[PDB]
Amino acid sequence: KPRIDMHSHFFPRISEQEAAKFDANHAPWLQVSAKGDTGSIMMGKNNFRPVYQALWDPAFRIEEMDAQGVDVQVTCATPVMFGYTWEANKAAQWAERMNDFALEFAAHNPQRIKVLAQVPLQDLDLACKEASRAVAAGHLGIQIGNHLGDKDLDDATLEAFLTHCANEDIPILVHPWDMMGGQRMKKWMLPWLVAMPAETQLAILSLILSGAFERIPKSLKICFGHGGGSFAFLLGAVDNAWRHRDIVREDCPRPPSEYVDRFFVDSAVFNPGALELLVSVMGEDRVMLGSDYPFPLGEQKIGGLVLSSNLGESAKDKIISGNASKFFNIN
Amino acid sequence: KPRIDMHSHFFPRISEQEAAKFDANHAPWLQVSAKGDTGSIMMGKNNFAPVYQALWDPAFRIEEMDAQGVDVQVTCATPVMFGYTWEANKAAQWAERMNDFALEFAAHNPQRIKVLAQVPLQDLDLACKEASRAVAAGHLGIQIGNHLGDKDLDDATLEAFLTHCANEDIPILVHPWDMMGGQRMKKWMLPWLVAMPAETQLAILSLILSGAFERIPKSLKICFGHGGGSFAFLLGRVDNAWRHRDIVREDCPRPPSEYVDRFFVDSAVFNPGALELLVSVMGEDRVMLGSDYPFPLGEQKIGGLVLSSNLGESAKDKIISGNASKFFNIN
Ligand SMILES: [Zn+2]
Ligand SMILES: [Zn+2]
Numbered sequence: 001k002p003r004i005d006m007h008s009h010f011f012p013r014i015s016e017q018e019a020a021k022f023d024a025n026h027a028p029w030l031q032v033s034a035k036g037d038t039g040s041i042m043m044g045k046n047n048f049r050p051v052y053q054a055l056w057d058p059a060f061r062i063e064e065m066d067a068q069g070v071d072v073q074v075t076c077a078t079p080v081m082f083g084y085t086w087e088a089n090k091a092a093q094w095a096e097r098m099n100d101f102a103l104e105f106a107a108h109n110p111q112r113i114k115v116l117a118q119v120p121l122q123d124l125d126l127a128c129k130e131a132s133r134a135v136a137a138g139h140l141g142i143q144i145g146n147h148l149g150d151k152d153l154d155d156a157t158l159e160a161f162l163t164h165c166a167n168e169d170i171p172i173l174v175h176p177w178d179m180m181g182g183q184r185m186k187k188w189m190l191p192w193l194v195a196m197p198a199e200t201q202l203a204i205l206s207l208i209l210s211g212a213f214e215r216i217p218k219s220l221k222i223c224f225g226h227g228g229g230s231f232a233f234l235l236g237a238v239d240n241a242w243r244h245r246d247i248v249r250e251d252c253p254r255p256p257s258e259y260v261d262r263f264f265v266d267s268a269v270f271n272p273g274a275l276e277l278l279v280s281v282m283g284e285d286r287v288m289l290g291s292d293y294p295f296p297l298g299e300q301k302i303g304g305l306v307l308s309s310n311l312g313e314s315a316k317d318k319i320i321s322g323n324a325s326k327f328f329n330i331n
Numbered sequence: 332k333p334r335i336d337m338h339s340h341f342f343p344r345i346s347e348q349e350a351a352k353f354d355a356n357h358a359p360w361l362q363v364s365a366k367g368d369t370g371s372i373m374m375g376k377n378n379f380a381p382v383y384q385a386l387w388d389p390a391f392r393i394e395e396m397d398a399q400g401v402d403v404q405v406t407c408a409t410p411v412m413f414g415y416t417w418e419a420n421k422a423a424q425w426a427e428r429m430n431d432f433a434l435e436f437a438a439h440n441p442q443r444i445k446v447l448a449q450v451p452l453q454d455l456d457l458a459c460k461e462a463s464r465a466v467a468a469g470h471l472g473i474q475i476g477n478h479l480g481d482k483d484l485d486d487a488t489l490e491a492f493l494t495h496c497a498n499e500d501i502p503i504l505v506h507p508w509d510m511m512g513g514q515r516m517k518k519w520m521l522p523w524l525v526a527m528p529a530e531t532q533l534a535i536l537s538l539i540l541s542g543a544f545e546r547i548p549k550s551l552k553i554c555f556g557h558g559g560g561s562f563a564f565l566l567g568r569v570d571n572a573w574r575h576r577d578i579v580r581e582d583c584p585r586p587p588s589e590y591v592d593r594f595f596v597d598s599a600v601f602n603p604g605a606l607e608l609l610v611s612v613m614g615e616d617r618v619m620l621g622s623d624y625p626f627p628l629g630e631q632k633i634g635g636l637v638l639s640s641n642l643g644e645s646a647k648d649k650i651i652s653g654n655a656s657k658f659f660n661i662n
Binding site for chain 1: 561576579604
């Protein structure tokens, strides 16, 4: 009965100088304070984001896992590490470097710390190669961003990558990143509060409404971060539009809501009513506990929202433990 | 009991020739085919969008309106006619006719057909005095968009505008418009399933997190179309961000969920669980029945969702009749 958190991030101890060998402007690296308790993710010379020790230090993280009653945590790249805009070969080198750093992180206690890998998604062949290599090396799966510029998950290159993983039994976490919105949502974390749930919804609907699930083998294990964004709540409007508009039916042979048996979501929706609706839509077998640790907006008491919810007790057990153990093949 | 429907749309019988007096190109007009049972919308030459002989030919509505237990139906501009892009005075000039053509469509039965006015929201005064003039002529309120044609949607410009309306007792229906993700969402009405609900959430949150409802008189009557988009589902995540991030609190002195008392939404969420969560969040006093009739994606059983739900009798009543009656002051 291990309590599993499957949505969490790490960032490796990369020096400015090493990041500079990749991109002096765009490669992230880590600056650590004096006391050693805090630091910032950097981009060239700019502060990109303040972080704390649990992000880069597995010893310290274990102690906090202990304090949260978290038995096993799955952790993956902070999305700033993706490098989807870089020249392909440099990005494939970078992913291999990041993925080895992840394995060194997990090696502190690989019974309790599991890792997912990143891939150079801008090149299908290198991405498939890196996925297979990383999983054979000990990663339990891959974390990708939800889009690659104007390419959403329905794009042939992304569908091909998903198919590869399906065929190789490689589970996928899809994480929103590089949020839409441009110039109008630049205050009060609006891109996190508005653009990010829209991104995740869009990625899910791109697979559904393009008929991608009719081409991708049922073996695909794929989870969408952050509760699937606004997907659960907006699904009625999607089923309605599908029934009453031809251009919505065009490539999708079944009502959209039926495809929920093809994917998973995490539980990070920050409200009992919201989580109940999510479980109602997805089914108790397809929601996994994830906290977004160790980021500020990560769940303060991991699993607390699930245990406070009105859900059945077996549904609670599945969300806290059972569903992830199965999804990521943890024993 | 009555059965009000505060969300429905119309488009007047403007000619190719007469519409060209504003803009033969960017200013829309109604092509009925020839006979009675069909017609299309032209921007001038091109076919903008097909449409339905019930959007106009009023009393036919009464058939539908009576065919579906409806009694009083508020109705307003199909968003094509906003012209927020344009030269101010000619859109000012343009809103006039549409608003005049509005009552002309309401003229048939000013008791069972109420209308709201469009304004040139791109110039305050023009929109102000037009909002003013239009109501005096019988309009029940004002429908605006969240955008301003191609805008970032916040300022004391519109703060002053909402204030203006709050003082002169002018209700507002906000309607999502000209959506956000541009080069993506090219298919399957993705802009309607994804961009528009995010847009409406963005409008609302922009008011809350700007600390606008603090300076706007509580007298403001404002309703958000389509259930407030994804607002209700995503609110927990918004409250969590406000509680744990300073920048989210910079201008909003209360948790955002505390501001639900300053606004209204319709019930058009096409799902019972979605509806139940909507009501749990906003309160029975602040959700109203609406349909987006006669549009294809409009509710097919006007009020049937609300009616076949398991909410309280007071709830069903305040939603189908009570709140519509008070918001728009209707007997
Ligand atoms: Zn995350
Ligand atoms: Zn509408």
